[PDB]
Write a new protein. Structure first.
Lengths: 225, 225
């Protein structure tokens, strides 16, 4: 039926689980929505400039920076808590039912994440959904972050798959744009506070769902339309 | 003395001048600090993926996306207002005096911006500081955004300058990283809500100042050291 390659953070696992840490350190949980794009921005800046550090290290550095920008104190305990929380986000309730449907419809399922590999158990193992997936890939061997073409190309290579056989699924349009630029299909799943960017001359996702159930409806529909 | 290449948006011209638009549309001026890194993020994503649209088009698209993410109503008049404010940010009052002293000290002054070439009057002309600079350069000729190496290399080639003759000045460490990766020097100017990122093997700025006056002093003093 094709191979569905899922983004992990925010797409499958719930980033708002970090909210309490932002509430405590900044007095405002909404600082999550400043820190996260800053983290992605710097991941892309390192990639454009030929530099690489593991995603969690960038996450901690950007947390310190945003703290400094707010004049908020950060302790080693805070940084350790950021690491623990970022590697233990729970799956959204809609994920396991959608993956069950997609597997039963014949799709092969893979993950692809900016996060560096961890010892077992991985965040997806902890969250109880790792067993849906036949492969768990990361940007770490590429030493480049999404949406660099190397990330998607090395993924297709590892899977022995052609771009026509692949669909990138994410709640970040920058990740779907990344994969579609390499000839893959793209599927966008809305998560709270994640809606698609629309811009002229930038390809739209092939599939768009307001949640994972709705995205799976569209994917399954496309098998026989 | 060397050639000082200035970032325009936020570095020379005051981004907080947009806060009232964010206050009105979102009920919270702090959404500026969500929207701005998302704008930079997406500029880098288009660059990584081989796509180019003018920076202002991305600004409007990201504004509409952030609005959708907050479930906030946005009208064509709001988008018009964004254009008005973004293209007319006033110069910080420390700017003209600092540029004056750098000129006195024999530095050549240039601007380099992600913003597309503007019809007259430009943001710098409106702000009354355009005439300090011998050249006003943009990412147009590179069709790629900062910190892509082509932007700096095309700028050096345009100026007939060697990397060792150039210093990129910005309040965004992503811009100084970009330039230093191409062998330029970097000078960081603190602006409210901007502090350097400290990350292993990421180059730190050669010069730092808490405002443009103090940075100018550092640059000027380095000629006698």
């Amino acid at each position: 039926s094709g191979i569905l390659v899922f983004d992990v953070n925010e797409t499958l696992l719930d980033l708002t689980s970090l909210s309490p840490l932002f509430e405590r350190v900044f007095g405002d949980a909404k600082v999550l929505r400043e820190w996260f794009p800053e983290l992605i921005l710097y991941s892309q800046t390192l990639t454009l400039t030929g530099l690489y550090r593991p995603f969690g290290e960038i996450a901690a550095a950007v947390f310190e920076m945003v703290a400094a920008n707010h004049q908020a104190k950060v302790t080693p305990d805070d940084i350790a808590e950021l690491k623990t929380r970022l590697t233990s986000m729970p799956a959204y309730p809609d994920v396991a039912p959608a993956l069950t449907r997609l597997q039963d419809a014949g799709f092969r399922l893979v993950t692809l994440t900016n996060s560096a590999p961890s010892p077992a158990p991985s965040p997806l193992e902890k969250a109880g959904i790792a067993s849906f997936f036949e492969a768990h890939l990361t940007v770490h061997s590429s030493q480049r972050f999404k949406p660099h073409p190397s990330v998607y190309d090395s993924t297709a290579e590892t899977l022995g798959a052609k771009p026509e056989e692949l669909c990138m699924i994410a709640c970040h349009i920058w990740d779907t744009i990344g994969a579609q630029a390499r000839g893959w299909r793209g599927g966008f799943v809305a998560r709270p506070h994640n809606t698609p960017l629309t811009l002229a001359e930038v390809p739209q996702p092939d599939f768009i769902g307001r949640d994972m159930g709705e995205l799976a409806d569209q994917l399954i529909a496309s098998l026989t339309a």
